[PDB]
Coordinates of N, CA and C in Angstrom, one line a residue:
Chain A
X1 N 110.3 53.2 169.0 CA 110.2 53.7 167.6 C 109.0 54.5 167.3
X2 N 107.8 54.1 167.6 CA 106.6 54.7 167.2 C 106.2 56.0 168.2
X3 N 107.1 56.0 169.7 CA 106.8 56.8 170.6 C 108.3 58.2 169.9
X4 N 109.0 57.9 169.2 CA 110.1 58.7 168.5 C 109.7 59.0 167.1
X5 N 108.9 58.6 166.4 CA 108.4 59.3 165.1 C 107.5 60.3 165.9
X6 N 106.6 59.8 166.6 CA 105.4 61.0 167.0 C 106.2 62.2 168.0
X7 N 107.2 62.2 168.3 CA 108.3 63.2 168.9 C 108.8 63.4 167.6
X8 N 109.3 63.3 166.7 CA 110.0 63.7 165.6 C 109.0 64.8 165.0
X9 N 107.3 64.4 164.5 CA 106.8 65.5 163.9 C 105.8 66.1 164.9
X10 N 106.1 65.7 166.2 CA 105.7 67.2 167.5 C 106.7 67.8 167.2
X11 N 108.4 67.6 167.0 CA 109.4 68.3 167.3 C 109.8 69.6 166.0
X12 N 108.9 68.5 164.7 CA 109.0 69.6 163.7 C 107.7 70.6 163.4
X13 N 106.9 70.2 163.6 CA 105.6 71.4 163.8 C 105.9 72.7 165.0
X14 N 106.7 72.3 166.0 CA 107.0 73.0 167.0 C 108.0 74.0 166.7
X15 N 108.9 73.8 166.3 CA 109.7 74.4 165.2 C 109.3 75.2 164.2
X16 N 108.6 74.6 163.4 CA 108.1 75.3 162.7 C 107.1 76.8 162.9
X17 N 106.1 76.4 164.0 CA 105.3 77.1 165.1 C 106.4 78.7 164.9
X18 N 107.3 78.0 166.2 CA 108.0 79.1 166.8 C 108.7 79.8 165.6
X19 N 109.3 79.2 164.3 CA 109.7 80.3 163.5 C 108.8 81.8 163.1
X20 N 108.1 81.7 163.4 CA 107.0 82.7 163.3 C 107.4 83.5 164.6
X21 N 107.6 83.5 165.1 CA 108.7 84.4 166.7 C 109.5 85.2 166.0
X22 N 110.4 84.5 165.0 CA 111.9 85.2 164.7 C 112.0 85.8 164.0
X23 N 112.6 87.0 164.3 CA 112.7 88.4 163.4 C 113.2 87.7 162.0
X24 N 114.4 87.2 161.5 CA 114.5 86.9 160.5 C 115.8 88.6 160.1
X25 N 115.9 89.2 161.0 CA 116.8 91.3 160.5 C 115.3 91.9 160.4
X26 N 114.3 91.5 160.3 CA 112.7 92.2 160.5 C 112.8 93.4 161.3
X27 N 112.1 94.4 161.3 CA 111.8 95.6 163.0 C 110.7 94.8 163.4
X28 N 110.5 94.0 163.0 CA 109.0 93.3 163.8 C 109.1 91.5 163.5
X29 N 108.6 90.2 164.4 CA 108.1 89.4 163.7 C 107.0 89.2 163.4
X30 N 106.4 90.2 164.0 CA 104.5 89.9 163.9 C 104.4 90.8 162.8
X31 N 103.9 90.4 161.7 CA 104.1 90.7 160.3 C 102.6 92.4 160.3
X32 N 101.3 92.3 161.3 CA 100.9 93.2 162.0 C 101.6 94.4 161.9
X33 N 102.5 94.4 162.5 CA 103.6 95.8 163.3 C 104.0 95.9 162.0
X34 N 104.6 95.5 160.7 CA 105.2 96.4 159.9 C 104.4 96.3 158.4
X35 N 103.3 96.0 158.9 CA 102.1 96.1 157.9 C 101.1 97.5 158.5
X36 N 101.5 98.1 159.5 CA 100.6 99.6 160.0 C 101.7 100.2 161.3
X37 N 102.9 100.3 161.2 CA 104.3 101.3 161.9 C 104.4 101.9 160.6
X38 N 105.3 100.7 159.5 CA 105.7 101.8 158.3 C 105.4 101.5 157.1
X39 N 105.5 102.7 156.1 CA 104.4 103.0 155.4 C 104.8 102.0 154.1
X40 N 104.2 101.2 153.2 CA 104.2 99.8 152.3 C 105.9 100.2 151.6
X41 N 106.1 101.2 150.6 CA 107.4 101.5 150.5 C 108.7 100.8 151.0
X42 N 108.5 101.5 152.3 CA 109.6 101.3 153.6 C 109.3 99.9 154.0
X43 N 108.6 99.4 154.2 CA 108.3 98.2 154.8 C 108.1 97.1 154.5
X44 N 108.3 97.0 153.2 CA 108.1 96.1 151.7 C 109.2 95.6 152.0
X45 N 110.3 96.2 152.5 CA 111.7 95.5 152.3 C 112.5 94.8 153.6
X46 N 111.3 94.9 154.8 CA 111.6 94.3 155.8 C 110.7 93.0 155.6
X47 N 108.9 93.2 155.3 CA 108.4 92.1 155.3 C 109.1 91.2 154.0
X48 N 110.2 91.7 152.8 CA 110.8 90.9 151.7 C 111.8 90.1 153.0
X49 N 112.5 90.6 153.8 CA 113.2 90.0 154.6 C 112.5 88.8 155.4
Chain B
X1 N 113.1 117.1 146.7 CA 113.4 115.6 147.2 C 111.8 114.7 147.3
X2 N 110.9 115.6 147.2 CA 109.5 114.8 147.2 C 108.9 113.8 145.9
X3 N 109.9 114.0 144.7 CA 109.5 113.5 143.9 C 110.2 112.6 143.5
X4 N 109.8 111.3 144.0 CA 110.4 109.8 143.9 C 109.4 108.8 144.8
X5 N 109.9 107.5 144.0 CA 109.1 106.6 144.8 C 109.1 106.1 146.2
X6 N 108.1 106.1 147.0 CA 108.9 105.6 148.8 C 108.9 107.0 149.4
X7 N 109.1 108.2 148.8 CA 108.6 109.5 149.4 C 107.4 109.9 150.5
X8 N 107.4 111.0 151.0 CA 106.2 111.5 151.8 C 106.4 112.9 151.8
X9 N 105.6 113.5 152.1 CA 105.2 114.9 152.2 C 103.7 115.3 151.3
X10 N 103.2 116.7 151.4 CA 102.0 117.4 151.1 C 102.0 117.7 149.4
X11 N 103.1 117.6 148.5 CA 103.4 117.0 147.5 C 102.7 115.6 147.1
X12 N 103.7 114.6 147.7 CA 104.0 113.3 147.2 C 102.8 112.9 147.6
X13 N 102.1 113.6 148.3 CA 101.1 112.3 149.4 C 99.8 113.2 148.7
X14 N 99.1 114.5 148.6 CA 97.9 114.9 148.5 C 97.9 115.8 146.5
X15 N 98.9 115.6 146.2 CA 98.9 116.3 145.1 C 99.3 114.9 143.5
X16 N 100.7 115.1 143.9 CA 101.1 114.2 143.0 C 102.3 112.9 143.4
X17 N 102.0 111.6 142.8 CA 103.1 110.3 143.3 C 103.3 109.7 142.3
X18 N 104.3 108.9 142.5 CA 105.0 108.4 141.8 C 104.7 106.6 141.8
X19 N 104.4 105.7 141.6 CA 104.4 104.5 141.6 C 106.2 103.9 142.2
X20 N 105.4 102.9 143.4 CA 106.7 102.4 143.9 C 107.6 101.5 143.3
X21 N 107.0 101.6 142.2 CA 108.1 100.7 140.7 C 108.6 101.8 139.4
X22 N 108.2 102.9 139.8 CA 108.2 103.8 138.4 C 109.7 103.6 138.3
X23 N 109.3 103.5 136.6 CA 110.6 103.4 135.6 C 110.9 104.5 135.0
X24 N 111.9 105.8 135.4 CA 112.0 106.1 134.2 C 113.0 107.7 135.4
X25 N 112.9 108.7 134.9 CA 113.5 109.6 135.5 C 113.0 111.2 135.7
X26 N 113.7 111.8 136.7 CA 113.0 113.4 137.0 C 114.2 114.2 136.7
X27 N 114.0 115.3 136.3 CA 114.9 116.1 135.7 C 114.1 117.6 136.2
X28 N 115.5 118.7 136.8 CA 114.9 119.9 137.6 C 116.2 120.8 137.7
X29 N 115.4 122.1 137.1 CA 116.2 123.4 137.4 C 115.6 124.4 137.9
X30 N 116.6 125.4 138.8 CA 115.8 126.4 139.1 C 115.0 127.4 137.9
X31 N 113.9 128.0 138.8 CA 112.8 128.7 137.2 C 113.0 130.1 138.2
X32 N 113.2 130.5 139.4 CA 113.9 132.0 139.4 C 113.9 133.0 138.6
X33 N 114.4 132.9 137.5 CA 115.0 133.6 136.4 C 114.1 134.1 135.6
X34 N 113.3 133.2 135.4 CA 111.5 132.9 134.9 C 110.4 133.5 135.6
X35 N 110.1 132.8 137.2 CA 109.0 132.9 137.6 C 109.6 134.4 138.7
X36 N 104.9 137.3 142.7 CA 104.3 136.4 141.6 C 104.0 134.9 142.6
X37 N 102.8 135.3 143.1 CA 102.4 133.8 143.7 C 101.0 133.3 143.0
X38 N 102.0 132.7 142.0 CA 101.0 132.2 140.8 C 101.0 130.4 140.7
X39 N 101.5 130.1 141.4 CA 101.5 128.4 141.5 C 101.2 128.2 142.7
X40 N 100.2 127.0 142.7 CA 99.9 126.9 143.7 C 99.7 125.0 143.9
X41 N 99.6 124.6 145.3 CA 99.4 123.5 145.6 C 98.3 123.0 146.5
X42 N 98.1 121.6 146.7 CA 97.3 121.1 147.4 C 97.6 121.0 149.4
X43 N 97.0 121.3 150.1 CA 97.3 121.4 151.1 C 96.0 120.0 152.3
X44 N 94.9 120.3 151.9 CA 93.5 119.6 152.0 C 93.2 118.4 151.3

């Protein structure tokens, strides 16, 4: 039990972590790349995604 | 076509813009008939 809670919130921090990887329909996940590729306008509506 | 929001060119970008929320509208006819290189723009 106590060795499966502490695997439960490794398992959701981990997850959580890696959502930061996924595009999400993004041109980028590294929020970086579409904060200086394209210009705030254009790119307002990928980082809204 | 330079004058709207989310634009680019030597217009939009060194002369005159628009806010990327502007509310309201542009309205345009040829002046031909009217206008001589008497208008000028920003280039620098």
């Amino acid at each position: 039990k106590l060795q499966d809670v502490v695997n439960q919130n490794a398992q959701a921090l981990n997850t959580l972590v890696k959502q930061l990887s996924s595009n999400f329909g993004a041109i980028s996940s590294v929020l970086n790349d579409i904060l200086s590729r394209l210009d705030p306008p254009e790119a307002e509506v990928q980082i809204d995604r | 076509r330079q004058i709207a929001p989310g634009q680019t060119g030597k217009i939009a970008d060194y002369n005159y813009k628009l806010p990327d929320d502007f509310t309201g509208c542009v309205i345009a006819w040829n002046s031909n008939n009217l206008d001589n290189y008497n208008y000028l723009y920003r280039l620098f």
